[PDB]
């Protein structure tokens, strides 16, 4: 607790190395307005005309939250640089909170001329939700993080969230949530707000390349003790003859060679070039799409399973809901042009990982024999089979930090497909509000709720420290590895830097895959 | 039960920062010309927004109804069955993956 | 070059900013940045104090030295002095230079 005259809080933004850890400090400026006039709102697709895919049913608050789940939001470009230069992986451990340096302000309007004054005696209210009893909103990659520069100043997004629904109604399992029915802290200009968390335990994310792939981990210049079958007839010279001929694995042979570890699972997309001449003529966004079907409702499957983007010297292609793609600041919200967006590309992977937009393989569909060919068909999608092995998604500086596990009875692999850390105890959601401030009552009692407000917002700072730990690179490599590095050359701006109108903008996603390490 | 679905799980307030691959095509007014247009995930677009997470495993089986009337008129249990192959010899499949029975 | 003290570790910049104050948002959510602001500015004091060490003149020489004067005779204005309108001001450069040494 301090006065009107002290602050509650310094500002800190900072990134430490120390060891085989890092920690992250980043402070914001935030203002959080009134949402929904203090109202609860129920909200639906009904009237809109959606498409059944796009039905829904939910509740709009009054409340705001912090989203502090982008990588950029931490780390600076150049913090970023030595992350994935310098390590194989890193993992986050622990998480610090704050908010203070509180200023509720009244807005009042007379004329044309609108005037903000100081409310030294307002509050705003402030929780986490430490118990994840409320639908857990983080996670699906919205906007309205801290933002990746640290002068801007970002205004607080408003919480809403789903339940089940039946076309646009509801059905009596639909839970509803008052957020005025938690307990909350009360801040005045003089409080301020703290708490603290701890990730569990999860595996480092990998940050590194194989330098070796599935199909080459074989001594090159040794035969193997195991046979294969080689031809089912025999050359001769008049005509072919059925026949039985065996071969032993050698190094001219690598592709038919028996191995033990398959390639990880595949669920096929399809390809679109960069060229806009190459592909068809036709919308097949949605009708092409890699789709799954849930209660009689399609979701485009996106960005699914990790998949290599295309194979090689194929750059120009990707799969069409199969990467992550970031706007440029110059992208508008609907239908922009390619050279405002920025795609990802999952290329290190193809060692381990089929490629997106090509069949797993093939598999026998018949019975062969004398009378009747043998026959064969593509393999579009493949489940875990025993002897798999598959990378992840890589992570991005833009891109989203943890997701919240479902509480569910099974799961497979449980690491989110947008990249990033699968978490079942997440960091909690904060959720922060105006709290709501009458105008003046009538003279004689009504029992009708209040509709009438003193308009007003609040503004503030917020810091959030996150411990890192790191995976140091062991590597016995003579050649030097590839880095991530800023173009020498001269040009006409700095690549993560303002512009001559104070714009921060970001050139290009930058992944964490450099370093190499063996298969 | 669970009070949300999977694909409900996004706050329909807020856009995303994901962009996804909206049109093959331009509209114009003349005629329909190849193009590679991108949008942000918005609320009014759930079903085309990029998610976490995927469904559970599926093996498909026979939908009959309770009324005799809508049922193809044949005896389709075992010639219809989804069943599984244990050396050469065939099992149908029952109850089989956890699945939901119906849709709403 | 231009003269004084050369310093591997010099006093080190001080820097100030006034705390970006947003005005109010608008009613329902942007992901843009805010561009508006309440107009404000600061004042106060500020302090400086700084210890120097002297190293005093040991002279054997007989007759006086030159020293830095100013002038006995009448003036209008007196040197290092505001005149009639408040305004401060500095009459002439005054190096450091008038005691003498030894080669």
Known sequence: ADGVGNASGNWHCDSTWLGDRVITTSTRTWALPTYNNHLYKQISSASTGASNDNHYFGYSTPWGYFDFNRFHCHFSPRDWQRLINNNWGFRPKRLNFKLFNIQVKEVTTNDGVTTIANNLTSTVQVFSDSEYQLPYVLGSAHQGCLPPFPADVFMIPQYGYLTLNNGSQAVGRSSFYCLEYFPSQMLRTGNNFTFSYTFEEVPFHSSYAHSQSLDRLMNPLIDQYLYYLNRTQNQSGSAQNKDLLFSRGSPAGMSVQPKNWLPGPCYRQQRVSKTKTDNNNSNFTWTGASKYNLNGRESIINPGTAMASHKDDEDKFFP????????????????????????????????????????????????????????????????????????????????????????????????????????????????????????????????????????????????????????????????????????????????????NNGLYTEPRPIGTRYLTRPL
């Open 320 to 499: 069409m809901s199969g990467v992550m793609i970031f706007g440029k600041e110059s992208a508008g919200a609907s239908n922009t042009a390619l050279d405002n967006v920025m795609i990802t590309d999952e290329e290190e992977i193809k060692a381990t990982n089929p490629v997106a937009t090509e069949r797993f393989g093939t598999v026998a569909v018949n019975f062969q024999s004398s009378s009747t060919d043998p026959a064969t068909g593509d393999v579009h999608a493949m489940g875990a089979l025993p002897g798999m092995v598959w990378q992840d998604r890589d992570v991005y500086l833009q891109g989203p930090i943890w997701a919240k596990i479902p509480h569910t009875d099974g799961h497979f692999h449980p690491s989110p497909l947008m990249g990033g850390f699968g978490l079942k105890n997440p960091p909690p959601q904060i959720l922060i509000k105006n709290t709501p401030v009458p105008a003046n009552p009538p003279a004689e009692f009504s029992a009708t709720k209040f509709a009438s407000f003193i308009t007003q917002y609040s503004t503030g700072q917020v810091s959030v420290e996150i411990e890192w730990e790191l995976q140091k690179e062991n590597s016995k490599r003579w050649n030097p590895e590839v880095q991530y590095t800023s173009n020498y050359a001269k040009s006409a701006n700095v690549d993560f830097t303002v512009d």
